[PDB]
Every structure is written in C-alpha cells, then in structure tokens.
Amino acid sequence: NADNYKNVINRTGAPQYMKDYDYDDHQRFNPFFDLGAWHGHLLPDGPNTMGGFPGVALLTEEYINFMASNFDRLTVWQDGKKVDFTLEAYSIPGALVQKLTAKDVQVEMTLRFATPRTSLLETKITSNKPLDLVWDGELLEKLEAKEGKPLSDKTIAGEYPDYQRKISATRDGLKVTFGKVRATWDLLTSGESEYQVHKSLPVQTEINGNRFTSKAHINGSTTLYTTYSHLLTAQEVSKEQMQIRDILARPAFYLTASQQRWEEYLKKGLTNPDATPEQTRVAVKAIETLNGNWRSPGGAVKFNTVTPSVTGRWFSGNQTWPWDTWKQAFAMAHFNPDIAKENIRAVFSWQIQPGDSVRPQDVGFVPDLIAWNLSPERGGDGGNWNERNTKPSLAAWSVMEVYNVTQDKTWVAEMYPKLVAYHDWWLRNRDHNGNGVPEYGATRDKAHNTESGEMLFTVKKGDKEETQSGLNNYARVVEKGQYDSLEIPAQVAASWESGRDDAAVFGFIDKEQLDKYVANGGKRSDWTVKFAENRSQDGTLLGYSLLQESVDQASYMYSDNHYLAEMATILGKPEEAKRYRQLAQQLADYINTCMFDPTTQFYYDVRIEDKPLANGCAGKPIVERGKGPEGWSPLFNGAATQANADAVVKVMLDPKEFNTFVPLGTAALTNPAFGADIYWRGRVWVDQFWFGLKGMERYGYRDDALKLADTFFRHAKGLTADGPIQANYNPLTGAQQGAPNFSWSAAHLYMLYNDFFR
Ligand SMILES: OC[C@H]1O[C@@H](O[C@H]2[C@H](O)[C@@H](O)[C@@H](O)O[C@@H]2CO)[C@H](O)[C@@H](O)[C@H]1O
Ligand SMILES: OC[C@H]1O[C@@H](O)[C@H](O)[C@@H](O)[C@@H]1O
Ligand SMILES: [Ca+2]
Ligand SMILES: [Mg+2]
C-alpha cells in the first residue's frame, strides 16, 4: 500500500523562477512525474500555495522548466465568505494528495497520472451548502535563480521573445500555448506545445494577460475531475483529446489503474521486507525516482525511456544514455519490466544501420546520448545528441535480466540481433590489433578529427594553446615532451566511452599530480596516451582506438558474450551460441593472462605496445597509472579465476586502497591521480560500488560485501533523509555530489536493498 510511504522525497515547493536551480544548476525542487508524462507537479508548501499543486514543471523536449508557481489553485467561497482552510499535503508512490479542512467545507485533492501526457486531479468536495469555487493561476515571469537567489533580473519573455505564452479558455477549462523556442541548452518547444486543463463540470474562465480566474458553482458535496496535459506537438494535442474525454467520462477507471499499477510496483519491487524501515524507504525512493525519470515516446525517441534525472540540468527531457539504460533496465526489470524493456528498445532504436547517412562505417554502433532532437548532423537541432562514443557493453546483461523476470522469449528474439550487431561493431571498430580484445576509443567525428581524417589535439605550454592534427604529428610531439599538457578530444571520448569521464587510466592527471608522480621517480611518459586509427582494408577510417585494452570493457564483453550464448541457445541457434562461448573463453584467458598483475594483485588496462609480449598479450598492465574500479570488473563479470579474484578482493578491502569511509570509489587512494572531489578519480558511485559487491559475492566474498553495504548505508550522507538521490559520494567524508534524482543511483540503491541491505 502506497499510503505507508508518505513524503519519501520532499516534493514541496513554490517555484518563483523558470530555472529555479540549486547550486549545480538542477531544478531545486522534485516534482511528481508518472506514466512517462512530460509534466510534473509539486506539493504546496504553505498558505500561499494551498488549494493547488504549484510549480507546474514542463519537460520542454530536453530540459525541465517551471511554467507557473500557482496554477489552477482552488479557493472556495461560501455565501461570500472565503473559506479559511487547514492544509495537509503529502506525496505517496504514484500520487500527490492534499486535504483542505474547514468547519463546514472540506476538499481532498488527489493527483495521479492517467496517460503518457495527462495527469488527473480528483477534487472531492464535502459541503452542506452550495459553494462558489474559484481557481486562479499565473505564469512565471522571472527566469533564473540559484538557491532562491536571482542570477539576473532577466525575465522569461525577455530571454525568449518567441515564447510568447498565452492562456486561452475552452468549453471545459483552459490551455496555455507556447511559441517556438529553439534554445539549445535551455528551452525547446515545437511552437505547437500546450498545457491543457479540462474539467468534469462547466467553469467560467476569465483571462487577464498571464493569469486566469475560473469560476464554478456546485450545489453541495461533489467530486470534480481535472486533467492536466503537457502536449508537445499538434499531433499530441489532437490525439490526447479523446483520452481526456474518456478520463473525465470514467475517471475511476484511471485512478484505479494508477492505484493498481503502483501497488504492483511496490509489491513486486519490495522483496526484502526484513530490511530496516529506512532501507525500505530508500527502495521506495528509488522506485519513485526511476519511475519519475521515465519518459514516454517523444520526438526522435519512439519508445518509453528513462533518463538519468528529470530534474537534472543536462539529464532531463528524454535524454537517454546506453550504460545508464542497461543499469536502469536491470533494476526496473524487477518492478516495472514493461518500461525496462522500453528503455532498452529506446537505446537500440538508434543503433547505426547499414547505409546510415552519417556514419555507415559504424554499423551496430549504439549512440551515447539520444534525445528528442537529432543533432545537426542528422537534420535536427539538438546540442545533446552524441555519437562521439558509445558506452560499455552491459546490454545483453540488461536484456537477460528482463528475460529472467518476464520469461518472454519474444523479448530475447527481438533483442538478440541488436546485441549481436553491437558486439560486432566493437570488434570491427574498436580492435586495432585484431586480437579480439577491444579498446575504448572515438568515432570518426568533427570533435575528433579534421574532415581529411587527421586526429585533433591541442598542445599547451604556459599560456600558449596550439591546436594541431595528425597522429604522426601527435607521436612526434609526445616523444619530444615540449609541452605542459595536451588536450585530446579522442582521449576525452575514449574516457566517455568507458563511462568514467577523465579517469586516471586514460591518462587524465592534474599538473600537480603529474609533477609529484615524476618527482617520486615516475616517468612523465607513463601517463602519455597513444592512439591508432582503425581503418578497413579499403582505407575507410572506422575511428580511433586508444592503444590500450581496458579490463572493464573486456570483462563486460566477456559476460555479454555469455548472455548472447544463452540467448542463442534459447532461440535454437546452437552454432552461434558455440561461437559466443568460445569468444567469451578467449576473452577470459586474455583478461587473466594479460590484464592481471599478480604483483600488485589487481587488474589493469594493458597497453597495445609496439610488439606484443611473448605470451601474446598486446602489452604490460598499466600498473603505474594506479588502481581503479575497472580492477574488479573481471569479478563482477565472472571472467576472473578464483585465485585472481581472491587477490583483487584483498585489495578492495584494503583501507589504503579502496576501503574508505564510503568504500570502493573510482580510484584507489594510492592512485597518483586520485581526488576525493573528482568524479571518476575517487568519488564513489553506487554502480561501481554495487559491481564490486556483486563481484565479491560471485567469488565467495558475500560476507565481506554485506559489511561494505552496511558501511555504505551508515556513511553515505543523506541516504535516510528525504532529499533526492544523487550520483556519487566523497569517499573520505561521504558528502553527496552530482545530479539529484539520479537514475542509476536509484537503480543500484534498489539492487543493494534487494541484494545487500540487511
Ligand atoms: O555529452 C556526452 C557526455 O555527457 C557527459 O555528461 C554530461 C556531463 O556530466 C555534464 O557536466 C555536461 O557536460 O553535460 C553532459 C551531458 O551532455 C557524460 O559524462 C559523458 O560520459 C558523455 O556521455
Ligand atoms: O548518467 C549520465 C552520465 O553522467 C555522467 O556524469 C557520467 O560520467 C556518465 O558515465 C553517465 O553516463
Ligand atoms: Ca585489441
Ligand atoms: Mg521477516
């Protein structure tokens, strides 16, 4: 029952600005979203907002933007006396509720979602006498603030002259229309988008500029219904009208469908009732978060999907990442498999096909970031769409988990060839030395190379920045050492392809950290990253590889290969299943032979050296760049031998390595490029944390994993409070950072609830 989990996240707030941002530019409030809808609602915070759900949050294609503070707020009049109500407002999973109580009149307002575009408000009025109902609303004026404090005195209309917001009135309520705004990083509307209000009774709505007042008279106790719809195109507007009429014709049907759908999420999802109440509350927060971040089909993304955070400054709209998705779907398989499936379909719906106009050399490539708007390269105007890189291979894992739950063979038959094609891309475009062990790298892309296909790089000495191109020129520069630093877009993308932006093993290290490394006897050239172009025998530039095979991706391709094998078996494709088992086995041999360092007792990426080693390995483990979470990837993925795993686990548990106040961060404390404030060189992310716990368990160390899980639960800050879930933690102090309502934190906090919280 949803009513046991009230106010799991604080969803109160009265937005005063379109961008009512917190310190890191995320909307500092947490609206309720559901059914994949494109608008959200907040609870009133007091007297000023009661009678309404303030802060209509709109998802304007790729961003979250508030529309109004008070919109369709009820005040009730009884024979010319304004009823002074007492307020009680709360959220539960799948609803907002507010109760207005006075002596003679009471109102109970219940807000759920009814469709992918429409929320449904039940306004249940109890009264002896007839009443006069007044609803009011007012569009926001001010643009931007941080922590409530204005960033400028700019207005919404000033900044977006074509936004030109107008309220109109309909034969059963009212609508806000919006002009076309193509503000790449802020606000994207089609010019046909609307916010529609329809009601089950006639109302008399008057409009004065950017506010309205609607009136109605009722003869006494009655239940009213209101729909709120953010409709983003004309096609959506037309298509939704019959939905709205069915909703208002049979509102009970939709309330019950929301009630039931949510009972089902909690029933399916809450499988560890022995968890502490606060742990259980964390799982519910996670479920609320993941479902809040679910977006129904929109623009270029023709499937339901889940973004990393609906309130996130760069994560909102339907902006979708692959490895985020794999993790999200894996978790969501257990309580909302329908959308788990969709999320995965959404990512693969933009897998590169033969004959692709932009990058035919990348067949099977899965884009890093898809969203409502295609990039200019594909005829859209989206600034977020990204095909510089993909993310790591956790896709078959995610698909198999959905299959584990649903036992739906049609799912496996649907996903198998997409997974095959993805596997095939890695081996074709990310395996420079042809040894079947992939590298991270970078696509042919305007961020990475010149039109003529020469790799870009920038040399910096003092205040001189010197932009250049060509791998051979890059090689000569690197050897000579006549620079302070280098910025290499293909290096950035390779690190983005691992998902661990700026991680040490990809050669990312601060000036002062590198100096100290060299002073301690290290060679500066130990951190130099090398690259090679991957060309088809016909000359075609397929992309760039770091001259480096990464242990995480090898390990992920390992398990991915096993899941392909199981799917092949399920689909009666015994030869293909054979091939994938043998490929897996080869990878495991290479992981253990090449990537394991028995001396430091850890796994590392290897260099592709100029000559392969005598054992066939492309190069030595890159021990000198330090230890990271990629070191237990072989364990999470089952590639490791027991002895290698035993060794890795001692390192994981070591306080001078990864056994920190919040343990298992993204670089060990001994990593020369460590920083507690650095996302992927020290901060603790819940995915990597959980992958380590799973790795440990798989090789017999579940008891130790439980204690790390307990330590994490006691130390990771804000976990038992009512704040939104964020992305990562300071390993030393446990302070939270990163986007609020962060999906894969929710996914993995949920899996921890399921797998490791006791
Ligand atoms: O754009 C592709 C990359 O996006 C990065 O994510 C955010 C980044 O965290 C944020 O600070 C800002 O730069 O916008 C980006 C989203 O467009 C990912 O971190 C990176 O791995 C790529 O996916
Ligand atoms: O959640 C979306 C993205 O957020 C970034 O901060 C992380 O570095 C990426 O690995 C992730 O894919
Ligand atoms: Ca290789
Ligand atoms: Mg019990």
Curated annotation (Swiss-Prot):
Q: Where is this region: A domain?
A: 277-758
Q: Where is this region: N-terminal domain?
A: 1-231
The question of whether Hydrolase is a record keyword is answered with yes
Q: Does the UniProt entry include the keyword Calcium?
A: yes
The EC designation for this entry is: 3.2.1.-
Segments for region (Linker): 231-276
| Binding residue positions for Ca(2+) | D431, N433, N435, V437, E439, E549
Q: Which residues form the active site?
A: D501, A727
Its family?
A: Belongs to the glycosyl hydrolase 63 family.
Function description: Glucoside hydrolase that cleaves the alpha-1,3-glucosidic linkage in nigerose. Has very low activity towards maltooligosaccharides, soluble starch, nigerotriose, kojibiose and trehalose.
What is the designated name of this protein? Glucosidase YgjK
From what organism does this protein derive?
Escherichia coli (strain K12)
